[PDB]
Write a protein that binds this ligand. Structure first.
Ligand SMILES: OC[C@@H]1O[C@@H](O)[C@H](O)[C@H]1O
Ligand SMILES: OC[C@@H]1O[C@@H](O)[C@H](O)[C@H]1O
Ligand SMILES: OC[C@@H]1O[C@@H](O)[C@H](O)[C@H]1O
Lengths: 496, 496, 496
């Protein structure tokens, strides 16, 4: 019933990179078609983009969105979605057994990223395509003009290069669910050669190599070690993916799963450093956590679609509707990323619109509303820029079904020297007792205390209204912050 | 002198899959051009199909034809043979050093197969091509509409998809004569990834993975083990090829070679089950014997043609003229296929028209006639449907030049329970003595005794008449079927 | 002081294959643009070729020219250099961060070769292309007509086929500087497979399989051994590459490096001879030294142009200005080449025009002079055809700073039956002492004694005049020819 913290200006971890507040839009389900893109609609601008979703994306201050996949890219032909809309084929999406009409291509989605204040992180097909087609698209997007593929982009109606900064070398081809699945050695070899060639057209890009699909894949972490061994001198990040679920209806254990995520991150970092010594590089690989969220609800009601109503345009796939306990994990995941901002410099909540998303529109026409997990993300993206200070913490301990010695309070401090604030994110994973948070701010006044709490852990939102929203609530003395955090609650504490 | 077997319904091996009476048409020699396709011929038709040869293959009751190869497939670009006949190019067929004019392509051949009451078994180029092009072809042939390659078939004049059921992942790439030769690991991976992609486009197809070119390749059967190791979960058959020849003028030995065929089949079956163990799979790989015949006569004039007379359209390649003794071995092989109907479920007599074939058309508008091998095949495909009874047999033996303890009689009884008939296929491999076959038919009225004999082993057929042809002949008490099998004869004995 | 050598028509070594006097034009810097092709210059013929450079090439008696690369070929798409010049696209050359206008293509450069009395040695792209694309280019060039890619060459204005006699399977793909770099086993297999299919199109070509980029690559000569182990049956040569430089400004050790070149060649022959035993072959693989020259001068100014003036057309890359000592190493190299005429049957001075070349043009206009190195290549190419006689030479020795026991006088004798000449090529790597070469000719009147000397080792040529040029100088009784060889001199002594 007591839990104490030391925070210390003079004791850094790293400076947060704003691209850990990134997200992700795949050509999956309704993410694009009647998601961000709804042409004739009364809520959509001239270009066909819904203006109300554009606003909700903007409240999340997302600086970077991954596109277009995801399993999708592994058999995507980027040429299909550029040029005259009349001349674009309908193609089979083998990943999500639906049909892709390809009205939103590179140029269309590059425009929507303007309107939401975000850079693209582009994924090349390394599944059924390779080196030279990754080069072409890089030439199309980044070369100013005067060559076959740059001029083709100008002719298509975009005179200035998109100048895309970060690229993913294909997408998690280690799974058996994946068109053009590759072995460690096959991918390490191809990621290397594609990295080498792409960096010859545009030496200012950064390239992400695909890590394991999940830490439960038998080949993790040898996949990482291998891939990196091949391509160390030509890449800048290794990617990680993790989704959690609560099909076990074990809220206590489900909230303990951010400890698996901490161990996962530490394992990938170990692998990197290991390969480093093997190469005697002075470089560090950074981490691109370009897929994370909660995802378990819509599992059964996606199997029905593919295939008994298959090859639909834009079927309602992966349409998870998130509960309160879910947003508790998201916050715990954000907090765990922030504790690792020294090697995680890019992260993507998967995904942004409709498909396991914080934003949702209703089917067949629209509405637009905030899921439970919108707000923890928002608080993180807004008050979580600056410097991360070490979690010098002692807090109570509790065990759960399949987890022992779980901290009752995860929390970290982010110190923005610019705005002379220190924001303290904290989550109480004790579903039962309430625990108060002493905080030895060896600083150098309390500014506010936002909170997200609820009685019913299974409570969802809906088009019809928000059951979960930041209620400014609660209650700091000498330079000692005293704050109380209810059983099972998300908390942002602020100081001026 | 006396050979005995007991024949009991309650002792089965399997049910015959009618697909073991299939054949094969390659873009080889005069098999298509100056064969089944002769556009301005009086005997021909609306589509250029010789109607006399359409009737001859109907006689053979062939339910499934592999197409278009064969070594030809490994460098074939299937789009060269579809769409506006004028726009189709002339291609070098590197395999058989011919020129392919592509006047007959997918759709042409596909509507010759209806006319002869058969279905395509489609081979995809995995020599100089790969996953993406296999998917393109599969979608073209099987996806209904509203997608690039299915609308392309529709625009091409075929409004209904061909819905091709069985597809062969390439062709025998283990040999050094193949353009695009692969090692076993190389091929095993591309077969695995193509199988996985195709089954995402159409889950109802069956896939066959390529086995060794022949049992005498030093990579046999480790090839079959490596391929299946990679592709087990996504493919349904493993292919087998076998040819026999009598270039040593030793008829006694030449007819014992069906014993070596049995040994070969058991090795592929064993290799399969071993890998089954590895994978801990409940699934059975079945055998696709998609290339078998006698083939030795024209070995020389083929070498004279390529390459002294290279790059012709429709050279007269691989035109074996078949002997009666050859027709004996073919029958001995069919019986041996039958005796393995439980694992062998697709088989292909290589090939159907003109090229090592039971049907010849003479040349430059030709004639059309049945070779000796036409007939044992017709007796098997016609009377060989139903259930195969375990050949409980004790018959005399004889050594040969290179084989020991070789049976004199080779029979298999198969039972059709709706027809209320039981047919005994039986061959006397003793080309000296005559043998009486006492068959205990555990009750259960004889219907006929068809026979294929000749005094002249090396006799042929020709356009000027048929020296070998079914002679209704011969020569059943209580329940003992006694019938006399002449030296070097093919016998089909029916009770009813 | 004195040095004894004896020739002998009886002590042979090999007939000179005139293809040891070959050269090489890459699409690199000003070799093509503002080099041999200047389509509105006052000195350029109907097609655009500077007729002064054509006359200068014709002086060098170059029978065979490698093209288009070189690193350029590893991302080249040969279709971009054929057809309407209006429709040819401009391409990023990743190799040299240049734009490729593709105004000179296969067909253009084939005409240039007629005018210089030379033939193409063609490189296919095996970095980002493969079997079927080398098959198309070989059908374009060598098939007479009546197929897709030969008819296409006809449509392009070359009715008869170029019939390219030797082809190069890719280019030095072991460096980390090259687009599409491959490993030993990758290249070994792509080479074996490409060779196998090409030789099915045109059996009369010869194929060159790439060796290492240099004798110093760690992978040397396991590369050579592995590649030949895959490709032995279908390739005909292994390539070699060596360049020299004097950045250390040690003249006498720099004239010594030809000993390293001899050692280099012997290792490769050892390696071929080892795989030959392994294969139990009766075939020898022959050596194609298709990149050799001195290269060290422009290494400063070459990086200053990339990437700081990147993506220019025709930048001044690799414009080495050759001194006199340079011409002397080039002379020894040609001697060491000729000395190995039994295994070296193709050799290319790299490169021909402006890029590390013997012929230069001044830029943005014209000029055309001869670099110092022009002259030893000229003498060798003109007087060095016939039979290389085995040299027996007792010559004095000398040490240098990093070479021990270095011949003072290096010499070799070529004998032409059709002129009973016996041209002798000798050089004095002793920059200090003068040596006289008695030559005991067991022939067989003296004809000339062309000489190449100068007292400033660092003296160059320029547009403003050649300071280094052949002087008919010097200074043969009955049996003995006596010839004084000044220090640092190249000599070509004749007999008739
Ligand atoms: O993000 C949803 C899907 O989950 C993962 O398996 C894939 O990367 C992605 O396409
Ligand atoms: O059936 C004729 C040929 O023989 C086999 O070896 C080839 O696969 C096939 O094309
Ligand atoms: O001089 C030739 C160039 O330099 C070499 O290193 C490359 O092979 C080639 O492109």
């Amino acid at each position: 019933k007591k839990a104490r913290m030391t925070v210390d200006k003079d004791y850094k971890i790293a400076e947060i990179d704003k691209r850990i507040y990134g997200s992700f839009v795949e050509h999956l389900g309704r993410a694009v078609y009647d998601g961000l893109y709804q042409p004739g609609n009364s809520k959509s601008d001239e270009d066909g983009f819904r203006k109300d979703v554009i606003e909700l994306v903007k409240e999340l201050n997302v600086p970077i969105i991954a596109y277009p996949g995801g399993n999708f890219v592994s058999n995507y032909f980027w040429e299909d979605g550029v040029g005259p809309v009349e001349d674009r084929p309908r193609r089979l999406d083998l990943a999500w057994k639906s049909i892709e009409p390809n009205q939103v291509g590179i140029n269309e989605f590059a425009k929507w990223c303007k309107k939401v204040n975000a850079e693209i992180m582009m994924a090349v097909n390394l599944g059924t395509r390779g080196i030279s087609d990754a080069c072409n698209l890089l030439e199309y997007c980044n070369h100013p003009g005067g060559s076959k593929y740059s001029d083709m982009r100008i002719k298509h109606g975009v005179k200035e290069p998109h100048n895309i900064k970060v690229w993913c070398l294909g997408n998690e081809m280690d799974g058996p669910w994946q068109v053009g699945h590759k072995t460690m050695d096959e991918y390490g070899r191809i990621a290397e050669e594609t990295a080498r060639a792409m960096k010859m057209i545009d030496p200012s890009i950064e390239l992400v190599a695909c890590g394991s699909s999940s830490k439960d894949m038998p080949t993790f972490p040898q996949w990482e070690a291998t891939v990196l061994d091949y391509a160390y001198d030509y890449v800048d990040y290794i990617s990680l993916h993790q989704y959690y679920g609560n099909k076990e209806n074990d809220t206590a254990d489900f909230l303990a799963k951010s400890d698996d995520l901490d161990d996962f991150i530490r394992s990938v970092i170990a692998t990197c450093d290991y390969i480093k010594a093997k190469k005697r590089s002075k470089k560090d690989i950074y981490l691109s956590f370009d897929e994370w969220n909660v995802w378990y609800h819509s599992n059964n009601e996606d199997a029905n679609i593919m295939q008994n109503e298959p090859w639909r345009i834009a079927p309602p796939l992966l349409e998870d509707i998130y509960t309160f306990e879910d947003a508790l994990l998201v916050g715990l995941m954000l907090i765990t990323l922030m504790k690792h901002a020294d090697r995680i410099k890019i992260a993507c909540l998967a995904q942004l619109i409709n498909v396991i998303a914080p934003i949702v529109t209703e089917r067949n026409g629209g509405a637009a509303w905030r899921q439970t997990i919108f707000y923890p993300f928002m608080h993180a993206s807004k008050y979580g820029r600056g410097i991360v200070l070490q979690p010098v913490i002692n807090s109570p301990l509790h065990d759960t079904s399949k987890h022992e010695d779980v901290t009752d309070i995860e929390s970290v401090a982010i110190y923005n020297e610019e705005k002379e604030e220190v924001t303290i994110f904290a989550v109480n994973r004790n579903i039962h007792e309430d625990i108060v948070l002493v905080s030895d701010v060896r600083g150098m006044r309390l500014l506010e205390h936002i909170v997200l709490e609820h009685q019913d852990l299974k409570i969802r939102n809906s088009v019809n209204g928000e059951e979960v929203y930041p209620k400014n609530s609660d209650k700091f003395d000498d330079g000692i912050l005293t704050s109380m955090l209810r059983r099972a609650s998300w908390n942002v504490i602020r100081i001026g």
